[PDB]
From a paper:
The architecture of p115 comprises a long central coiled-coil region, a large globular N-terminal domain and a C-terminal acidic region. p115 binds to a specific set of soluble N-ethylmaleimide-sensitive-factor attachment protein receptors (SNAREs), aiding formation of a cis-SNARE complex that promotes the antero-grade ER-to-Golgi transport by targeting COP II vesicles to the Golgi apparatus. In addition to its major role in exocytotic transport, p115 functions in retrograde Golgi-to-ER trans-port, intra-Golgi transport and Golgi biogenesis of the Golgi apparatus, due to essential interactions with the coat-protein complex I (COP I) subunit β-COP and the conserved-oligomeric-Golgi complex (COG) subunit COG2.
We used a construct comprising the globular head region of p115 (p115GHR, residues Asp54 to Tyr629) for crystallization. The fragment lacks 53 N-terminal residues that are predicted to be disordered and the C-terminal coiled-coil domain (p115CC). p115GHR consists of a multi-helical β-catenin-like armadillo fold arranged in a regular right-handed superhelix. We observe 10 classical armadillo repeats (ARM1-ARM10) and one non-canonical repeat which we termed USO repeat, after the yeast homolog of p115, Uso1p. The armadillo repeats exhibit long loops (5 to 13 residues) in ARM5-ARM9. This structural motif of elongated loops culminates in the formation of a short helix inserted in the H2-H3 loop (37 residues) of the terminal USO repeat which we named the USO helix. It folds back into the superhelical groove, leading to a globular C-terminus of p115GHR and covering helices H3 of ARM8-ARM9, while the USO helix points into the center of the groove. In the crystal structure, a dimeric arrangement between p115GHR molecules results from their packing along a dyad axis. The USO helix and the USO repeat helix H2 are part of the dimer interface which covers only 635 Å2 (∼2.6%) of the total 24,000 Å2 of solvent-accessible surface (SAS).
Residue numbers in the entry: 55 to 92, 111 to 265, 271 to 358, 360 to 629
Write the structure that this text describes.
Protein backbone atom coordinates (compact mmCIF):
# COMPACT_ATOMS: atom_id res chain seq x y z
CA UNK A 1 0.00 0.00 0.00
CA UNK A 2 1.03 3.59 -0.69
CA UNK A 3 -0.85 4.56 2.49
CA UNK A 4 1.87 3.58 4.96
CA UNK A 5 1.61 7.37 5.20
CA UNK A 6 -1.83 7.21 6.89
CA UNK A 7 -0.64 5.40 10.01
CA UNK A 8 2.25 7.86 10.46
CA UNK A 9 0.58 11.30 10.43
CA UNK A 10 -1.07 9.71 13.43
CA UNK A 11 2.15 8.86 15.27
CA UNK A 12 3.07 12.50 14.75
CA UNK A 13 -0.19 13.37 16.50
CA UNK A 14 0.90 11.38 19.58
CA UNK A 15 4.18 13.32 19.57
CA UNK A 16 2.36 16.64 19.67
CA UNK A 17 -0.31 15.95 22.29
CA UNK A 18 0.70 13.01 24.51
CA UNK A 19 4.09 14.26 25.72
CA UNK A 20 3.37 13.77 29.44
CA UNK A 21 3.39 10.01 28.73
CA UNK A 22 7.05 9.26 27.89
CA UNK A 23 6.40 5.54 27.22
CA UNK A 24 4.08 6.45 24.32
CA UNK A 25 6.42 9.13 22.99
CA UNK A 26 9.21 6.54 23.04
CA UNK A 27 7.09 4.05 21.16
CA UNK A 28 5.98 6.54 18.51
CA UNK A 29 9.48 7.79 17.81
CA UNK A 30 10.68 4.19 17.73
CA UNK A 31 7.85 3.22 15.39
CA UNK A 32 8.50 6.31 13.23
CA UNK A 33 12.20 5.35 13.00
CA UNK A 34 11.04 1.90 11.90
CA UNK A 35 8.88 3.35 9.08
CA UNK A 36 11.45 5.93 7.86
CA UNK A 37 14.58 3.76 8.23
CA UNK A 38 13.36 0.71 6.15
CA UNK A 39 12.85 7.36 0.98
CA UNK A 40 9.25 8.26 0.19
CA UNK A 41 8.06 8.73 3.80
CA UNK A 42 10.94 11.02 4.81
CA UNK A 43 9.97 13.68 2.23
CA UNK A 44 6.45 13.65 3.67
CA UNK A 45 7.58 13.81 7.34
CA UNK A 46 9.70 16.90 6.65
CA UNK A 47 7.19 18.71 4.36
CA UNK A 48 5.47 19.86 7.56
CA UNK A 49 8.59 21.57 8.95
CA UNK A 50 7.35 22.07 12.54
CA UNK A 51 7.63 18.27 12.82
CA UNK A 52 11.45 18.63 12.71
CA UNK A 53 11.30 21.45 15.31
CA UNK A 54 9.15 19.09 17.47
CA UNK A 55 11.79 16.38 17.22
CA UNK A 56 14.40 18.93 18.20
CA UNK A 57 12.22 19.76 21.25
CA UNK A 58 11.81 16.07 22.07
CA UNK A 59 15.64 15.66 22.14
CA UNK A 60 15.84 17.94 25.18
CA UNK A 61 14.08 15.13 27.06
CA UNK A 62 16.56 13.27 29.25
CA UNK A 63 14.45 10.08 29.26
CA UNK A 64 16.55 7.38 27.65
CA UNK A 65 13.56 5.83 25.94
CA UNK A 66 12.66 9.16 24.29
CA UNK A 67 16.09 10.67 23.40
CA UNK A 68 17.61 7.50 21.89
CA UNK A 69 14.91 6.77 19.20
CA UNK A 70 14.84 10.60 18.74
CA UNK A 71 18.56 10.63 17.89
CA UNK A 72 18.21 7.68 15.51
CA UNK A 73 15.16 9.18 13.77
CA UNK A 74 16.82 12.54 13.22
CA UNK A 75 19.98 10.88 11.86
CA UNK A 76 17.75 8.91 9.45
CA UNK A 77 16.06 12.12 8.24
CA UNK A 78 19.53 13.72 7.91
CA UNK A 79 21.12 10.83 6.01
CA UNK A 80 18.25 10.76 3.48
CA UNK A 81 17.43 14.44 2.87
CA UNK A 82 20.58 16.11 4.24
CA UNK A 83 20.50 19.58 2.65
CA UNK A 84 16.84 20.17 3.52
CA UNK A 85 16.81 18.84 7.04
CA UNK A 86 20.11 20.72 7.70
CA UNK A 87 18.41 23.93 6.52
CA UNK A 88 15.34 23.51 8.74
CA UNK A 89 17.72 22.97 11.70
CA UNK A 90 20.07 25.95 10.92
CA UNK A 91 17.08 28.29 10.55
CA UNK A 92 15.66 27.04 13.89
CA UNK A 93 17.17 29.02 16.84
CA UNK A 94 19.58 27.19 19.22
CA UNK A 95 19.06 24.27 16.78
CA UNK A 96 22.70 23.14 16.40
CA UNK A 97 23.71 24.08 20.03
CA UNK A 98 21.04 21.86 21.39
CA UNK A 99 22.04 18.89 19.24
CA UNK A 100 25.58 19.35 20.61
CA UNK A 101 24.35 18.68 24.15
CA UNK A 102 23.91 15.05 23.01
CA UNK A 103 27.70 14.79 22.86
CA UNK A 104 27.58 15.73 26.57
CA UNK A 105 25.27 12.87 27.42
CA UNK A 106 26.76 10.56 30.05
CA UNK A 107 24.94 7.43 28.79
CA UNK A 108 27.42 6.44 26.11
CA UNK A 109 24.85 4.69 23.87
CA UNK A 110 23.43 8.20 23.31
CA UNK A 111 26.68 10.11 22.87
CA UNK A 112 27.96 7.54 20.40
CA UNK A 113 24.81 7.71 18.25
CA UNK A 114 25.06 11.47 18.97
CA UNK A 115 28.42 11.59 17.08
CA UNK A 116 26.80 9.73 14.17
CA UNK A 117 23.96 12.29 14.16
CA UNK A 118 26.42 15.24 13.99
CA UNK A 119 28.24 13.58 11.06
CA UNK A 120 24.95 13.61 9.13
CA UNK A 121 24.31 17.17 10.27
CA UNK A 122 27.67 18.60 9.21
CA UNK A 123 28.10 16.64 5.99
CA UNK A 124 28.73 19.05 3.09
CA UNK A 125 27.38 22.03 5.10
CA UNK A 126 30.03 24.72 5.75
CA UNK A 127 28.07 27.04 8.08
CA UNK A 128 26.94 24.15 10.35
CA UNK A 129 30.54 22.90 10.47
CA UNK A 130 31.57 26.31 11.76
CA UNK A 131 28.78 26.41 14.45
CA UNK A 132 29.66 22.93 15.74
CA UNK A 133 33.23 24.22 16.22
CA UNK A 134 31.93 27.38 17.99
CA UNK A 135 30.08 24.93 20.27
CA UNK A 136 33.37 23.38 21.50
CA UNK A 137 33.35 20.28 19.23
CA UNK A 138 37.15 20.19 18.78
CA UNK A 139 37.94 19.87 22.47
CA UNK A 140 35.02 17.50 23.14
CA UNK A 141 35.91 15.14 20.30
CA UNK A 142 39.64 15.19 21.12
CA UNK A 143 38.67 14.36 24.76
CA UNK A 144 36.56 11.33 23.77
CA UNK A 145 39.46 10.08 21.58
CA UNK A 146 41.96 10.37 24.51
CA UNK A 147 39.47 8.63 26.80
CA UNK A 148 38.92 5.73 24.37
CA UNK A 149 42.68 5.06 24.22
CA UNK A 150 43.22 6.96 20.95
CA UNK A 151 43.98 4.80 17.88
CA UNK A 152 43.42 1.79 20.15
CA UNK A 153 39.76 2.79 20.56
CA UNK A 154 36.84 1.17 18.76
CA UNK A 155 34.37 2.30 16.11
CA UNK A 156 33.88 5.21 18.56
CA UNK A 157 37.21 6.89 17.71
CA UNK A 158 36.65 6.06 14.06
CA UNK A 159 33.36 8.04 14.32
CA UNK A 160 34.93 11.11 16.05
CA UNK A 161 37.68 11.17 13.40
CA UNK A 162 35.14 11.15 10.59
CA UNK A 163 33.26 14.02 12.31
CA UNK A 164 36.55 15.98 12.93
CA UNK A 165 37.29 15.65 9.19
CA UNK A 166 33.80 16.87 8.26
CA UNK A 167 34.69 20.01 10.31
CA UNK A 168 38.14 20.54 8.82
CA UNK A 169 38.02 19.24 5.27
CA UNK A 170 37.33 22.08 2.77
CA UNK A 171 36.90 24.49 5.64
CA UNK A 172 39.62 27.08 6.04
CA UNK A 173 37.84 29.05 8.75
CA UNK A 174 37.77 25.93 10.92
CA UNK A 175 41.34 24.89 10.10
CA UNK A 176 42.44 28.31 11.30
CA UNK A 177 40.26 28.03 14.43
CA UNK A 178 41.75 24.56 15.13
CA UNK A 179 45.29 25.87 14.87
CA UNK A 180 44.50 29.10 16.74
CA UNK A 181 42.99 27.02 19.54
CA UNK A 182 46.18 24.95 20.14
CA UNK A 183 44.48 21.68 19.19
CA UNK A 184 47.27 20.52 16.83
CA UNK A 185 49.40 19.53 19.82
CA UNK A 186 46.68 17.10 20.90
CA UNK A 187 47.24 15.27 17.59
CA UNK A 188 50.67 14.13 18.76
CA UNK A 189 49.90 11.36 21.25
CA UNK A 190 47.86 9.85 18.39
CA UNK A 191 51.27 8.75 17.04
CA UNK A 192 52.88 6.41 19.59
CA UNK A 193 53.55 3.02 17.90
CA UNK A 194 49.30 -5.40 18.30
CA UNK A 195 47.87 -3.60 15.22
CA UNK A 196 44.25 -4.76 14.62
CA UNK A 197 42.16 -3.85 11.55
CA UNK A 198 40.54 -1.14 13.72
CA UNK A 199 43.85 0.36 14.91
CA UNK A 200 44.97 0.57 11.23
CA UNK A 201 41.63 2.26 10.40
CA UNK A 202 41.84 4.80 13.23
CA UNK A 203 45.46 5.69 12.50
CA UNK A 204 44.77 6.18 8.76
CA UNK A 205 42.10 8.82 9.56
CA UNK A 206 44.47 10.52 12.03
CA UNK A 207 47.14 10.92 9.25
CA UNK A 208 44.54 12.26 6.79
CA UNK A 209 43.57 14.84 9.45
CA UNK A 210 47.25 15.90 9.74
CA UNK A 211 47.35 16.04 5.93
CA UNK A 212 44.19 18.29 5.75
CA UNK A 213 45.85 20.91 7.92
CA UNK A 214 48.99 21.11 5.68
CA UNK A 215 47.53 20.45 2.24
CA UNK A 216 49.23 22.10 -0.77
CA UNK A 217 45.70 23.15 -1.70
CA UNK A 218 45.30 25.47 1.32
CA UNK A 219 46.00 29.18 1.34
CA UNK A 220 49.83 29.10 1.58
CA UNK A 221 50.05 30.78 5.05
CA UNK A 222 47.57 28.30 6.50
CA UNK A 223 49.81 25.33 5.65
CA UNK A 224 52.96 27.23 6.74
CA UNK A 225 51.68 27.95 10.23
CA UNK A 226 50.37 24.42 10.82
CA UNK A 227 53.74 23.05 9.59
CA UNK A 228 55.49 25.30 12.17
CA UNK A 229 53.07 24.28 14.92
CA UNK A 230 53.64 20.62 14.05
CA UNK A 231 57.37 21.17 14.45
CA UNK A 232 57.00 23.28 17.60
CA UNK A 233 54.93 20.70 19.47
CA UNK A 234 56.90 17.60 18.37
CA UNK A 235 54.36 16.10 15.94
CA UNK A 236 56.75 16.01 12.91
CA UNK A 237 59.35 14.50 15.21
CA UNK A 238 56.81 11.81 16.30
CA UNK A 239 55.82 10.95 12.73
CA UNK A 240 59.50 10.35 11.88
CA UNK A 241 59.83 7.83 14.74
CA UNK A 242 57.04 5.82 13.04
CA UNK A 243 59.16 5.73 9.85
CA UNK A 244 62.06 3.77 11.31
CA UNK A 245 60.05 1.71 13.84
CA UNK A 246 59.80 -2.10 13.49
CA UNK A 247 56.63 -4.03 12.55
CA UNK A 248 54.28 -1.30 11.31
CA UNK A 249 51.92 -2.41 8.49
CA UNK A 250 53.22 -1.51 5.04
CA UNK A 251 50.17 0.69 4.26
CA UNK A 252 50.50 2.67 7.55
CA UNK A 253 54.14 3.18 6.53
CA UNK A 254 53.42 4.38 2.97
CA UNK A 255 50.85 6.88 4.28
CA UNK A 256 53.10 8.10 7.15
CA UNK A 257 55.66 8.99 4.43
CA UNK A 258 53.10 10.88 2.35
CA UNK A 259 52.07 12.79 5.49
CA UNK A 260 55.65 13.76 6.49
CA UNK A 261 56.06 14.80 2.79
CA UNK A 262 53.35 17.43 3.20
CA UNK A 263 54.41 18.44 6.74
CA UNK A 264 57.90 19.38 5.39
CA UNK A 265 57.09 20.62 1.89
CA UNK A 266 58.38 24.14 1.53
CA UNK A 267 59.24 24.56 5.23
CA UNK A 268 63.01 24.98 5.83
CA UNK A 269 62.99 24.13 9.55
CA UNK A 270 61.02 20.94 8.84
CA UNK A 271 63.14 19.93 5.83
CA UNK A 272 66.32 20.66 7.87
CA UNK A 273 64.92 18.42 10.60
CA UNK A 274 63.87 15.68 8.20
CA UNK A 275 67.35 15.39 6.61
CA UNK A 276 68.88 15.21 10.10
CA UNK A 277 67.07 11.93 10.93
CA UNK A 278 69.19 8.74 10.78
CA UNK A 279 68.14 5.07 10.86
CA UNK A 280 70.11 2.37 12.78
CA UNK A 281 72.72 0.22 10.92
CA UNK A 282 76.40 2.01 9.39
CA UNK A 283 73.63 4.57 10.19
CA UNK A 284 71.63 5.91 7.23
CA UNK A 285 70.45 9.49 6.55
CA UNK A 286 66.77 9.85 5.78
CA UNK A 287 67.48 11.11 2.24
CA UNK A 288 69.52 7.95 1.65
CA UNK A 289 66.83 5.53 2.91
CA UNK A 290 64.24 7.33 0.69
CA UNK A 291 66.44 7.09 -2.39
CA UNK A 292 67.34 3.43 -1.71
CA UNK A 293 63.67 2.38 -1.66
CA UNK A 294 62.86 4.55 -4.68
CA UNK A 295 65.49 2.65 -6.75
CA UNK A 296 64.66 -0.79 -5.27
CA UNK A 297 62.73 -2.90 -7.81
CA UNK A 298 61.41 -5.31 -5.16
CA UNK A 299 59.67 -2.54 -3.15
CA UNK A 300 55.96 -2.03 -3.99
CA UNK A 301 55.11 0.65 -6.59
CA UNK A 302 52.94 2.47 -4.07
CA UNK A 303 55.96 2.84 -1.72
CA UNK A 304 58.37 4.03 -4.42
CA UNK A 305 55.91 6.82 -5.24
CA UNK A 306 55.71 7.84 -1.55
CA UNK A 307 59.49 8.08 -1.18
CA UNK A 308 59.79 10.03 -4.46
CA UNK A 309 57.21 12.47 -3.06
CA UNK A 310 58.94 12.78 0.33
CA UNK A 311 62.15 13.57 -1.65
CA UNK A 312 60.56 16.29 -3.87
CA UNK A 313 58.89 17.65 -0.77
CA UNK A 314 62.35 17.79 0.93
CA UNK A 315 63.83 19.75 -2.02
CA UNK A 316 60.79 22.02 -2.54
CA UNK A 317 61.90 25.67 -2.26
CA UNK A 318 64.98 24.21 -0.51
CA UNK A 319 68.16 25.49 -2.22
CA UNK A 320 70.30 24.26 0.70
CA UNK A 321 69.12 20.70 0.14
CA UNK A 322 69.30 20.92 -3.62
CA UNK A 323 73.01 21.78 -3.36
CA UNK A 324 73.57 19.09 -0.72
CA UNK A 325 72.22 16.57 -3.28
CA UNK A 326 74.18 17.88 -6.27
CA UNK A 327 77.53 18.21 -4.45
CA UNK A 328 77.29 14.42 -3.79
CA UNK A 329 77.73 13.97 -7.58
CA UNK A 330 80.97 16.00 -7.41
CA UNK A 331 82.83 13.86 -4.86
CA UNK A 332 85.14 15.76 -2.49
CA UNK A 333 86.25 12.95 -0.16
CA UNK A 334 87.39 9.32 0.09
CA UNK A 335 85.69 7.18 2.72
CA UNK A 336 88.26 4.62 3.88
CA UNK A 337 85.61 2.03 4.75
CA UNK A 338 83.92 0.91 1.52
CA UNK A 339 80.72 1.47 3.54
CA UNK A 340 78.68 4.63 2.95
CA UNK A 341 76.49 5.30 -0.11
CA UNK A 342 75.39 8.80 -1.11
CA UNK A 343 72.44 10.46 -2.86
CA UNK A 344 74.40 11.22 -6.05
CA UNK A 345 75.57 7.61 -6.41
CA UNK A 346 72.10 6.12 -5.87
CA UNK A 347 70.63 8.54 -8.44
CA UNK A 348 73.34 7.87 -11.02
CA UNK A 349 72.72 4.16 -10.54
CA UNK A 350 69.02 4.79 -11.06
CA UNK A 351 69.44 6.89 -14.19
CA UNK A 352 71.28 4.05 -15.94
CA UNK A 353 69.58 0.99 -14.37
CA UNK A 354 67.66 -1.44 -16.62
CA UNK A 355 64.49 -0.75 -14.62
CA UNK A 356 62.56 2.12 -16.30
CA UNK A 357 60.67 2.91 -13.05
CA UNK A 358 64.11 3.67 -11.55
CA UNK A 359 65.14 5.67 -14.65
CA UNK A 360 62.03 7.86 -14.48
CA UNK A 361 62.19 8.42 -10.67
CA UNK A 362 65.91 9.18 -10.59
CA UNK A 363 65.46 11.59 -13.47
CA UNK A 364 62.54 13.43 -11.90
CA UNK A 365 64.29 13.35 -8.52
CA UNK A 366 67.25 15.09 -10.22
CA UNK A 367 65.07 17.67 -11.98
CA UNK A 368 63.73 18.49 -8.54
CA UNK A 369 67.29 19.12 -7.32
CA UNK A 370 67.78 21.59 -10.22
CA UNK A 371 64.47 23.51 -10.30
CA UNK A 372 64.85 27.29 -10.15
CA UNK A 373 68.49 26.83 -9.22
CA UNK A 374 70.90 28.11 -11.84
CA UNK A 375 73.85 27.50 -9.48
CA UNK A 376 73.14 23.77 -9.25
CA UNK A 377 72.27 23.54 -12.99
CA UNK A 378 75.80 24.83 -13.62
CA UNK A 379 77.36 22.52 -11.04
CA UNK A 380 75.63 19.48 -12.57
CA UNK A 381 77.40 20.42 -15.86
CA UNK A 382 80.72 19.44 -14.23
CA UNK A 383 79.61 15.80 -13.47
CA UNK A 384 81.75 13.29 -15.38
CA UNK A 385 80.92 9.63 -15.74
CA UNK A 386 83.33 6.71 -16.10
CA UNK A 387 83.05 4.69 -19.33
CA UNK A 388 85.18 1.66 -20.26
CA UNK A 389 88.54 0.54 -18.81
CA UNK A 390 90.36 2.43 -21.61
CA UNK A 391 88.04 5.24 -22.85
CA UNK A 392 87.66 8.98 -21.96
CA UNK A 393 84.91 10.14 -19.53
CA UNK A 394 81.45 11.26 -20.71
CA UNK A 395 79.48 14.03 -18.94
CA UNK A 396 76.16 13.32 -17.16
CA UNK A 397 74.28 15.70 -19.49
CA UNK A 398 75.63 13.98 -22.59
CA UNK A 399 75.05 10.47 -21.28
CA UNK A 400 71.41 11.37 -20.58
CA UNK A 401 71.12 12.61 -24.20
CA UNK A 402 72.88 9.42 -25.29
CA UNK A 403 70.23 7.08 -23.84
CA UNK A 404 67.56 8.83 -25.95
CA UNK A 405 69.01 7.31 -29.16
CA UNK A 406 69.47 3.86 -27.61
CA UNK A 407 66.59 1.42 -27.96
CA UNK A 408 65.32 2.62 -24.59
CA UNK A 409 61.67 2.31 -23.47
CA UNK A 410 59.56 5.52 -23.63
CA UNK A 411 59.14 5.73 -19.83
CA UNK A 412 62.93 6.15 -19.47
CA UNK A 413 63.11 8.76 -22.25
CA UNK A 414 60.18 10.82 -20.97
CA UNK A 415 61.94 10.76 -17.55
CA UNK A 416 65.20 11.87 -19.25
CA UNK A 417 63.66 14.49 -21.50
CA UNK A 418 61.86 16.07 -18.49
CA UNK A 419 65.31 16.28 -16.82
CA UNK A 420 67.01 17.64 -19.95
CA UNK A 421 64.21 20.27 -20.49
CA UNK A 422 64.28 21.33 -16.84
CA UNK A 423 68.09 21.36 -16.89
CA UNK A 424 68.50 23.62 -19.94
CA UNK A 425 65.47 25.82 -19.03
CA UNK A 426 66.57 29.31 -17.88
CA UNK A 427 70.24 28.26 -18.10
CA UNK A 428 72.05 29.63 -21.19
CA UNK A 429 75.31 27.82 -20.22
CA UNK A 430 73.78 24.30 -20.19
CA UNK A 431 72.28 25.13 -23.60
CA UNK A 432 75.86 25.80 -24.85
CA UNK A 433 77.20 22.55 -23.36
CA UNK A 434 74.29 20.71 -25.06
CA UNK A 435 74.68 22.43 -28.45
CA UNK A 436 78.49 21.95 -28.36
CA UNK A 437 78.11 18.19 -29.06
CA UNK A 438 77.32 18.02 -32.79
CA UNK A 439 75.41 14.73 -32.42
CA UNK A 440 72.55 16.44 -30.52
CA UNK A 441 70.71 18.90 -32.77
CA UNK A 442 70.73 16.42 -35.74
CA UNK A 443 69.22 13.87 -33.33
CA UNK A 444 66.37 16.10 -32.12
CA UNK A 445 65.63 17.30 -35.66
CA UNK A 446 65.51 13.66 -36.78
CA UNK A 447 63.19 12.40 -34.04
CA UNK A 448 60.83 15.39 -34.40
CA UNK A 449 60.72 15.27 -38.23
CA UNK A 450 59.83 11.63 -38.85
CA UNK A 451 56.15 10.54 -38.70
CA UNK A 452 56.12 7.84 -35.98
CA UNK A 453 52.64 6.56 -35.05
CA UNK A 454 50.95 7.77 -31.84
CA UNK A 455 52.92 6.06 -29.06
CA UNK A 456 56.08 7.91 -30.00
CA UNK A 457 54.19 11.20 -30.37
CA UNK A 458 54.92 11.98 -26.72
CA UNK A 459 58.75 11.58 -27.04
CA UNK A 460 58.67 13.62 -30.33
CA UNK A 461 56.85 16.43 -28.50
CA UNK A 462 59.39 16.49 -25.64
CA UNK A 463 62.28 16.69 -28.17
CA UNK A 464 60.55 19.71 -29.74
CA UNK A 465 60.31 21.27 -26.27
CA UNK A 466 64.07 20.59 -25.80
CA UNK A 467 65.05 21.92 -29.21
CA UNK A 468 62.74 24.90 -28.57
CA UNK A 469 64.44 25.55 -25.21
CA UNK A 470 67.82 25.45 -27.09
CA UNK A 471 66.58 28.39 -29.15
CA UNK A 472 64.71 30.38 -26.51
CA UNK A 473 67.43 30.31 -23.82
CA UNK A 474 70.27 30.59 -26.37
CA UNK A 475 72.64 33.48 -25.65
CA UNK A 476 74.22 33.29 -29.15
CA UNK A 477 77.75 32.67 -27.74
CA UNK A 478 78.20 29.38 -29.63
CA UNK A 479 78.82 30.40 -33.27
CA UNK A 480 78.12 26.84 -34.54
CA UNK A 481 74.43 26.81 -33.42
CA UNK A 482 72.96 30.31 -32.95
CA UNK A 483 69.27 31.33 -32.56
CA UNK A 484 68.47 32.21 -36.18
CA UNK A 485 70.39 29.23 -37.58
CA UNK A 486 68.42 26.92 -35.27
CA UNK A 487 65.08 28.36 -36.55
CA UNK A 488 66.16 27.90 -40.18
CA UNK A 489 67.11 24.27 -39.27
CA UNK A 490 63.53 23.69 -38.06
CA UNK A 491 62.09 25.42 -41.13
CA UNK A 492 64.23 23.34 -43.57
CA UNK A 493 64.31 19.97 -41.75
CA UNK A 494 60.86 19.90 -40.17
CA UNK A 495 58.63 22.86 -41.11
CA UNK A 496 57.76 25.43 -38.38
CA UNK A 497 53.99 24.78 -38.34
CA UNK A 498 54.68 21.03 -38.19
CA UNK A 499 57.21 21.68 -35.36
CA UNK A 500 54.68 23.60 -33.25
CA UNK A 501 52.16 20.76 -33.59
CA UNK A 502 54.57 18.09 -32.22
CA UNK A 503 55.32 20.43 -29.33
CA UNK A 504 51.53 20.46 -28.72
CA UNK A 505 51.37 16.65 -28.35
CA UNK A 506 52.58 17.10 -24.75
CA UNK A 507 49.74 19.26 -23.36
CA UNK A 508 47.24 17.07 -25.25
CA UNK A 509 48.43 13.74 -23.89
CA UNK A 510 45.52 12.01 -22.15
CA UNK A 511 47.49 12.02 -18.83
CA UNK A 512 48.77 15.55 -18.93
CA UNK A 513 45.70 17.16 -17.24
CA UNK A 514 45.55 14.97 -14.12
CA UNK A 515 49.31 15.25 -13.63
CA UNK A 516 48.78 19.02 -13.43
CA UNK A 517 46.16 19.07 -10.63
CA UNK A 518 48.17 18.20 -7.44
CA UNK A 519 51.85 17.55 -6.43
CA UNK A 520 51.44 13.99 -5.18
CA UNK A 521 52.40 11.18 -7.58
CA UNK A 522 48.92 10.04 -8.61
CA UNK A 523 49.65 6.99 -10.85
CA UNK A 524 47.23 3.98 -10.60
CA UNK A 525 49.90 1.57 -11.85
CA UNK A 526 53.54 1.72 -13.19
CA UNK A 527 52.40 2.22 -16.79
CA UNK A 528 50.90 5.61 -15.76
CA UNK A 529 54.12 7.01 -14.31
CA UNK A 530 54.70 9.35 -17.21
CA UNK A 531 54.29 13.03 -16.23
CA UNK A 532 55.56 14.80 -13.11
CA UNK A 533 53.45 17.62 -11.69
CA UNK A 534 56.18 20.31 -11.71
CA UNK A 535 57.08 19.48 -15.35
CA UNK A 536 53.46 20.17 -16.44
CA UNK A 537 54.04 23.71 -15.14
CA UNK A 538 57.20 24.21 -17.16
CA UNK A 539 55.35 23.09 -20.31
CA UNK A 540 52.51 25.55 -19.53
CA UNK A 541 55.10 28.24 -18.80
CA UNK A 542 57.22 27.80 -21.97
CA UNK A 543 55.00 26.41 -24.74
CA UNK A 544 53.50 29.79 -25.61
CA UNK A 545 56.72 31.79 -25.60
CA UNK A 546 58.65 29.13 -27.56
CA UNK A 547 55.95 29.25 -30.26
CA UNK A 548 56.09 33.04 -30.35
CA UNK A 549 59.91 32.91 -30.57
CA UNK A 550 59.89 30.52 -33.55
CA UNK A 551 58.96 33.54 -35.78
Amino acid sequence: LEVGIQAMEHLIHVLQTDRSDSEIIGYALDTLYNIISNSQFTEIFIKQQENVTLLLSLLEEFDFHVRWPGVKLLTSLLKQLGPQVQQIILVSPMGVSRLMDLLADSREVIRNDGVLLLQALTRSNGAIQKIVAFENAFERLLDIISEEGNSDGGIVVEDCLILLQNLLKNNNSNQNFFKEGSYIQRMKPWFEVGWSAQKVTNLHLMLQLVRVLVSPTNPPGATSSCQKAMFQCGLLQQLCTILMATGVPADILTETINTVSEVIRGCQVNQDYFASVNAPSPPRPAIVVLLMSMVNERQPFVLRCAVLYCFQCFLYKNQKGQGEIVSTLLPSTIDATGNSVSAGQLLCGGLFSTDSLSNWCAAVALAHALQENATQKEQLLRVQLATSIGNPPVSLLQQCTNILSQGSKIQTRVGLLMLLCTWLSNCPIAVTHFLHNSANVPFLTGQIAENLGEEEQLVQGLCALLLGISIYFNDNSLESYMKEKLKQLIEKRIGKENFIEKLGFISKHELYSRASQKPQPNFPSPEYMIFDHEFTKLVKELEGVITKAIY
